[PDB]
């Protein structure tokens, strides 16, 4: 016999080049032999290949023209290879084909015209290839086509409007090409369409009113297209829509109140448009809503209170608008809230007490608002809290004491607030706390005595909050690389054991009342870069050890009263501003060279 089936398959084996693992399975011993081969599925009756799965075997080369001899083939998967060059027209001769997967290859040049010859093609996946030029208009002739994916190539030009003739089509992914032009409204006529992904192109004009006609549309993503203009209000009619991504566009005008009808709606993202308006009060009614993201628009409003009662809402991103009024105080009460960032607004009022109600909230960003009152003590009982940044507010009273209990708490910025009294001592207990900024607050008290025992604290800044008393004694100082204490009343000597902070980079002790000698242990710090000791009561001589330090960049000792020679060393080329207002300092830099005798002040 002469088996076309065998000629075809063996042509495939010789023409595609891959590791042994690929075609080693395909062998002819010395009786319909190919059906036992990897990814070859015969028809139970005819012994013709009805399915060929060649995917994800690193293989290169060109498809041989002999592939047309598998004339019973319903299923061809070449996905996830290194295949290259023009798409072979050979494929278009397999006319019983149903699904064809070309994806995650590198196929180049134009797409070839034969595709319409596959009358029954249901599924076509070309995602992530190298194609250029126009999308093929033949696709519009595929009557049974359900899934079409041309995303992730370099296609240019307009989406062919004739596509809107594919009335069995449920899935169109065009995103991630260079397609231009206005979106053809005829696309709205696709009746069975549910998924539409067009984003990350460069388009013209708006979403056409006619897309409102897509009765069954569920997912709609067109982002980082250059779409602009007023946001079509007829879209509220899409009652099955559950995913709407319009972000990173130029849409203007307001949010049509009609959108309160998108009742299946789960995720909604309008980030980074210019959308000025306010949130429709009707949004209370989206019961399945989960993601709500309005970031970086021009919206100005009051958040509708009903959003606090949205049962399924998990993430809420309102930042970089100008909202006013207060947050709905019922907010966290659904026990599903996970991240919330409302920063850089005009919000006022108290922080809602319920935000963590279910212990699922790990990201709370309130900063650069007008929030007032005390920090709800419930935040200290929130076990999932990870990152908390509330600075630049009116927050009040005393910082509640339960934060060091929190096993995940990493980043806390409480600065630029009105806090008073005492700095919770469990901050130095916090197991993972990496960054703590209490700067510019009004507590008049001393630092927690154990503050430098913090295991993981890298950046600690208390500057310009009214601190009194001495500096605690730097015992662990395990992770600290930035320490900002300047602008307080701290008294006493600088602790001798500052040497224990091995990873220290920047140290600002400026603008205090700190007396005594400058500890030489500073110069034994391996990595120390910025030291600002200025505007203190420091006396005595500058330890000569500091000229031996090859690592140190800014050393600002000015407006103390020190004496004796300035270290010669790396200090030689240092900014002479650093030694000013010390009238007993001596040396070349300050232009009063040194008395040389037996008795000096050094050693």
């Amino acid at each position: 016999k002469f088996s076309p089936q065998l000629l075809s398959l063996l042509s495939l084996k010789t023409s595609l080049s891959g590791p042994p693992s690929a075609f080693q399975d395909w062998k002819v011993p010395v009786d319909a032999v190919w059906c036992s081969w990897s990814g070859v599925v015969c028809d139970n009756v005819t012994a013709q290949v009805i399915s060929l799965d060649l995917s994800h075997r690193n293989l290169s080369g060109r498809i041989p023209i002999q592939i047309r001899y598998l004339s019973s083939l319903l299923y061809l998967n070449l996905s996830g290879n290194s295949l290259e060059g023009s798409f072979p027209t050979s494929i278009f001769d397999l006319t019983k084909l149903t699904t064809l997967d070309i994806s995650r290859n590198s196929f180049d040049s134009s797409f070839p015209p034969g595709i319409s010859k596959l009358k029954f093609l249901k599924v076509f996946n070309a995602f992530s290839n190298n194609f250029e030029g126009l999308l093929p208009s033949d696709v519009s002739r595929l009557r049974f086509l359900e899934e079409l994916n041309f995303g992730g190539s370099y296609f240019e030009g307009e989406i062919p409007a004739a596509y809107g003739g594919l009335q069995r089509l449920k899935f169109i992914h065009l995103a991630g090409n260079v397609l231009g032009g206005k979106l053809p409204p005829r696309l709205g006529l696709l009746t069975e369409l549910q998924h539409m992904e067009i984003g990350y192109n460069h388009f013209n004009g708006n979403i056409p009113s006619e897309f409102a006609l897509l009765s069954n549309l569920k997912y709609f993503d067109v982002s980082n297209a250059s779409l602009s203009g007023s946001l079509p209000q007829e879209l509220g009619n899409l009652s099955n829509l559950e995913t709407l991504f319009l972000f990173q566009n130029g849409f203007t005008g307001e949010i049509p109140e009609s959108y309160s009808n998108l009742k299946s709606l789960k995720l909604l993202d309008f980030s980074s448009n210019q959308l000025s308006g306010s949130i429709p009060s009707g949004f209370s009614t989206l019961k399945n809503l989960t993601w709500l993201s309005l970031i970086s628009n021009n919206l100005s409003g009051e958040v509708p209170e009903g959003i606090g009662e949205l049962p399924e809402l998990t993430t809420l991103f309102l930042w970089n608008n100008n909202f006013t009024g207060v947050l709905p105080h019922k907010l966290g009460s659904n026990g599903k809230l996970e991240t919330m960032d409302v920063s850089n607004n005009s919000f006022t009022g108290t922080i809602p007490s319920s935000l963590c109600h279910g212990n699922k909230l790990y990201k709370l960003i309130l900063f650069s608002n007008m929030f007032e009152g005390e920090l709800p003590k419930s935040l200290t009982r929130c076990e999932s809290l990870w990152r908390f940044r509330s600075q630049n507010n009116r927050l009040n009273g005393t910082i509640p004491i339960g934060f060091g209990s929190l096993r995940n708490l990493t980043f806390v910025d409480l600065s630029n607030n009105r806090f008073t009294d005492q700095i919770p001592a469990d901050f130095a207990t916090a197991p993972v706390l990496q960054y703590l900024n209490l700067s510019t607050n009004f507590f008049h008290r001393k630092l927690p005595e154990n503050i430098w025992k913090a295991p993981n604290l890298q950046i600690f800044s208390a500057s310009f909050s009214n601190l009194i008393g001495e500096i605690p004694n730097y015992v662990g100082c395990k992770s600290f690389y930035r320490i900002e204490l300047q602008g307080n009343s701290l008294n006493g000597t600088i602790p001798w054991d500052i040497g224990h902070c091995e990873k220290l980079l920047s140290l600002n002790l400026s603008q205090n009342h700190l007396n005594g000698i400058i500890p030489w242990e500073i110069s034994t710090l391996p990595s120390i870069a910025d030291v600002d000791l200025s505007h203190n009561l420091l006396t005595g001589t500058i330890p000569s050890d500091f000229g031996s330090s090859k690592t140190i960049t800014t050393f600002n000792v000015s407006y103390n009263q020190l004496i004796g020679p300035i270290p010669s060393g790396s200090f030689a080329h240092l900014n002479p501003s650093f030694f000013s207002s010390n009238e007993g300092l001596c040396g070349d830099l300050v232009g009063k060279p040194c008395n040389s005798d037996s008795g000096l002040e050094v050693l």
Binding site: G152, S153, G176, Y200, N224, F245, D341
Partner: peptide
């Protein structure tokens, strides 16, 4: 090539 999907992940 890769194309992005899902919601805008800008963060603070």
């Amino acid at each position: 090539h890769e194309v992005p999907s899902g919601p805008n992940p800008i963060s603070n």
